[PDB]
């Protein structure tokens, strides 16, 4: 199927009323022709009978357009098409893009040369008159209850995800927790980010989880993508009237939205994404249309730059304003392990011989997992316990204490929200109406592991929170400050002169430094000293204030 028309009304029985004396009569009609009365039989006055449109009797019709499917084509040719008409009961049963088998009567009709003239052409037009077309529980609850009461159900449900991926268990657990989510002020849903080299299996993983949830959506940050992240207004190709096209983020409200090549989206896209993830709504003001939309959606993103000398945010393009919103962040790269390659190749060989003897079992577990998630989502609301409250408070205190040795901040309320959401999701996986220490200890484990992998400074082997809140290691900050002080001292040592040449200062600094200072570093130091009201840069000359 390619396109479907709006619904068309169609006449069945005309209603005629006399203008002179209000007498009425009905006319059953003949293959499209109406037998209009010439005279009112009651009052014998000619040309006095009028057709009353809204008193007549009508029926429904629709026009559908269909194309031959790509498999049965001759090589290299373009496809053929036909027009179908469907009446009464069948009038709205298909939508564009899907595929059908149809039975009908093959009709043929003449066409007129012009709307005024009554001559007809000698070559007829044909269409299909549709008659039929075909498209190509307590037991479950008790099974789910028994399965949920089985030990290590959290590991089992996580293991069920993406059988093509053999080792990334804690990532699967994080994705499972995102699918379960918290419950309803504060944003209850979870956002996850995947980072590392291109060509890794992350896009396949997005496409896998996309296919597991009813309200799911999938698109790319590239401009070539099939549907945009931004809402817009356009003219209908049929009527040429305006229609409002909401973006993928709006459509995935109360659902999961998978985004690919996230790293190379443009600034306007980043801005609207920031708005959506902070406010959970989207604002529009264009062409006379002014409104606010609900856009409470769960984001799952895959990103790219590997370079171990620098942390994730230091390698990839995007700002800390966005990266600081994900509840957890994961990194994917090769381990350079012989046993890992051997196991991966062995799993690949097993997949080469993949067979119904286990494909059916994985399919059954997938169906049961869909039922498990749907049931849990439909009824379960985890609520706080004294043990969980104590453990969560202690976790926040641990993170504040971790910064105390450096005399600095290392926790703030958003971190505690991530722990709470993860603990609620873990409680819901157990089908528990109470969130409890079992959930919090696992939430601490996942959060600590995520901090270790995402926010370690590779220059020291220690988690540096300023990486996640400013985009750089504190090492970079110290180096920039030291460079600015060295530059200031160099200018002061030549302070008898009001203007110094840019290239001369670059050569002075680079001749006195151990680091091979770049043009960007030198200019950032100059800009810092200009913001400090110490100097003004006028082209190739640096001048004192």
């Amino acid at each position: 199927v390619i396109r479907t028309s709006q619904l068309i009304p169609e006449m069945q029985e005309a209603f005629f009323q006399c203008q002179v004396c209000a007498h009425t009569t009905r006319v059953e009609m003949d293959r499209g022709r109406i037998a209009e009365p010439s005279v009112c039989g009651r009052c014998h006055t000619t040309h006095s009978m009028a057709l009353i449109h809204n008193r007549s009797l009508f029926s429904d019709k629709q026009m559908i357009k269909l194309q031959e499917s790509p498999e049965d084509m001759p090589a290299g040719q373009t496809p053929h098409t036909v027009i179908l008409f469907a009446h009464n009961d069948l009038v709205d049963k298909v939508q564009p893009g899907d595929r059908v088998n149809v039975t009908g009567i093959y009709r043929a009709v003449p066409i007129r040369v012009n709307p005024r003239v009554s001559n007809v052409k000698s070559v007829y037009k044909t269409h299909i008159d549709v008659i039929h077309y075909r498209k190509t529980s307590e037991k479950r609850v008790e099974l789910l209850k028994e399965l949920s009461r089985k030990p290590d159900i959290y590991e089992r449900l996580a293991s069920a995800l993406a059988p093509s991926i053999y080792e990334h268990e804690d990532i699967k657990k994080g994705i499972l927790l995102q699918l379960f989510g918290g419950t309803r002020k504060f944003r209850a849903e979870i956002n996850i980010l995947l980072c590392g080299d291109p060509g890794t299996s992350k896009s396949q993983l997005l496409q896998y989880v996309y296919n597991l949830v009813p309200r799911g959506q999938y698109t790319s940050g590239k401009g070539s993508s099939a549907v945009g992240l931004t809402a817009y207004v356009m003219k209908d190709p049929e009527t040429r009237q305006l229609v409002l096209q909401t973006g993928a983020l709006v459509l995935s409200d109360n659902g999961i939205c998978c985004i690919d090549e996230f790293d190379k989206m443009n600034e306007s896209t980043r801005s609207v994404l920031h708005e959506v993830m902070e406010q959970q709504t989207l604002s529009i003001a264009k062409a006379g249309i002014i409104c606010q939309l609900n856009a409470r959606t769960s984001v799952l993103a895959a990103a790219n730059p590997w370079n171990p000398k620098k942390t994730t945010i230091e390698n990839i393009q995007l700002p800390h304003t966005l990266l600081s919103r994900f509840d957890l962040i994961f990194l994917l790269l090769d381990p350079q392990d012989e046993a890992y390659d051997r196991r991966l190749a062995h799993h690949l060989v097993a997949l080469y011989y993949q067979s119904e003897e286990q494909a059916e079992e994985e399919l059954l577990d997938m169906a049961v997992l869909k039922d498990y998630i749907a049931y849990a989502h439909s009824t379960i609301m985890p609520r706080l316990s004294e043990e969980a409250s104590q453990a969560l408070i202690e976790a926040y205190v641990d993170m504040r204490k971790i910064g105390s040795s450096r005399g600095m901040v290392s926790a703030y309320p958003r971190q505690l929200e991530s722990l709470i959401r993860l603990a609620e999701a873990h409680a819901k996986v157990r089908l528990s109406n109470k969130v409890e220490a079992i959930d919090v200890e696992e939430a601490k484990r996942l959060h600590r592991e995520a901090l270790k992998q995402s926010a370690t400074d590779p220059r020291t082997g220690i988690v540096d929170i300023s990486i996640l809140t400013t985009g750089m290691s504190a090492t970079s900050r110290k180096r920039k400050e030291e460079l600015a002080e060295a530059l200031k001292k160099l200018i002061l040592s030549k302070g008898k002169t009001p203007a110094l040449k840019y290239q001369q200062l670059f050569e002075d600094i680079r001749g006195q430094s151990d680091i091979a200072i770049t043009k960007d570093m030198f200019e950032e130091a100059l800009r810092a000293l200009a913001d400090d009201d110490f100097l003004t840069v006028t082209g190739k000359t640096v001048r004192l204030l």
Partner: protein
């Protein structure tokens, strides 16, 4: 023209739309973007271009009906329309709305003791400490009386407030909280989510390749309150336009095909980050922040928020958060009282002039002794 609301659209489907007809007293009661319920009847409308009459002629993959005298040898086709008989959303006004209960409540508030602190507590119950900020932001809601000088120039009414602080702490809470409380308010940022940004912009309309305007945040926030986040990082184009918008409360455009003066009558509450994230407690605000002196001189009040890792304070904040998750005046009382209070237009007394001029003189000579 109407369209299926977001709640009804079945997954993967394109939206359907319908033509609605309004008559007599119901006319111009709905604007584009509104969501409403319509009551009436579905009707069938013919193609009027192919009928003929003694008064007027006919103008001229489907076929219509045939065989009426008025239709000649042409054929006639119909379309669906919805005729709506009714449509509804899906000073004296105060006297009409306030019952004796509301009158008694605003009277009790007028007679209340330490009402200032009571309203601070009632409007900002979640906040900890920082009373000066609460008093300052509360006063902004009451504004100030605008005045027109006899020669036609006018004097500014609204106050503007600025809050600078560390990304870890309270400044974001105030913005989102007052936005949730207040009527007719806008939240945005210096890194705006549209081509217009904070002030009006020009765009070419492809229906004629003709230049037209598009509204920015400060136009939509006219007669309201505007909340701007990450104000330290902003486009230069908007930054120049803000110079006029802050004091003259208007925006002026003069480009190809467009010449206009636009209103921007607004109270602004801005939030900003100091350089290096944490505020340097040893240095002035002017050394800490990114803003230039002309913009900075516009605001009537400034405040600074910066953290330190005191164990008891951290433990108290954590317990407050987890307790909130575990669970004097209502917001509607504040709304009703505020709308009552804003009808007063108090004068300055003759004796107050002496104190005002004295205090300004004292401030000026202090500034001259060690700009205002």
């Amino acid at each position: 023209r109407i369209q299926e609301t977001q709640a009804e659209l079945p997954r993967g489907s394109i939206p359907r739309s319908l033509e609605v007809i309004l008559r007599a007293e119901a006319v111009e009661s709905a604007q584009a973007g509104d969501k409403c319920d319509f009551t009436g009847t579905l009707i069938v409308v013919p193609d009027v271009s192919k009928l003929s009459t003694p008064g007027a002629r006919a103008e001229t993959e489907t076929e219509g009906i045939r065989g009426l005298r008025a239709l000649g040898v042409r054929d006639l086709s119909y379309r669906l329309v919805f005729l709506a008989c009714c449509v509804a959303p899906t000073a004296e006004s105060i006297k009409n709305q306030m019952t004796v209960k509301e009158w008694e409540k605003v009277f009790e508030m007028s007679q209340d003791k330490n009402l200032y602190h009571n309203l601070c507590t009632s409007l900002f119950p979640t906040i900890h400490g920082n009373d000066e900020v609460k008093r300052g932001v509360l006063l902004m809601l009451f504004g100030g009386v605008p005045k027109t000088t006899g020669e036609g120039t006018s004097l500014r009414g609204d106050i503007n407030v600025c809050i600078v602080g560390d990304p870890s702490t309270a400044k974001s809470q105030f913005l989102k909280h007052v936005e949730e409380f207040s009527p007719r308010a806008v939240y945005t940022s210096g890194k705006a989510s549209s081509a217009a940004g904070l002030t009006a912009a020009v765009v070419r309309d492809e229906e004629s390749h003709e230049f037209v305007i598009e509204a920015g945040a400060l136009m939509l926030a006219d007669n309201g309150v505007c909340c701007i986040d990450e104000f330290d990082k902003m486009d230069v184009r908007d930054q120049v336009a803000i110079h006029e918008a802050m004091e003259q409360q208007t925006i002026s455009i003069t480009k190809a095909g467009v010449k206009a003066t636009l209103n921007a009558r607004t109270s602004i509450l801005a939030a900003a980050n100091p350089i290096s994230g944490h505020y340097d407690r040893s240095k002035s605000l002017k050394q800490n922040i990114n803003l230039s002196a002309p913009i900075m001189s516009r605001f009537d009040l400034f405040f600074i928020l910066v953290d330190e890792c005191n164990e008891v304070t951290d433990y108290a904040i954590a317990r407050r958060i987890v307790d909130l998750h575990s669970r004097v005046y209502s917001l509607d009382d504040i709304r009703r009282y505020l709308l009552f209070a804003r009808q007063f237009k108090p004068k300055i007394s003759k004796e107050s002039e002496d104190f005002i001029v004295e205090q300004y003189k004292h401030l000026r000579q202090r500034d001259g002794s060690g700009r205002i």
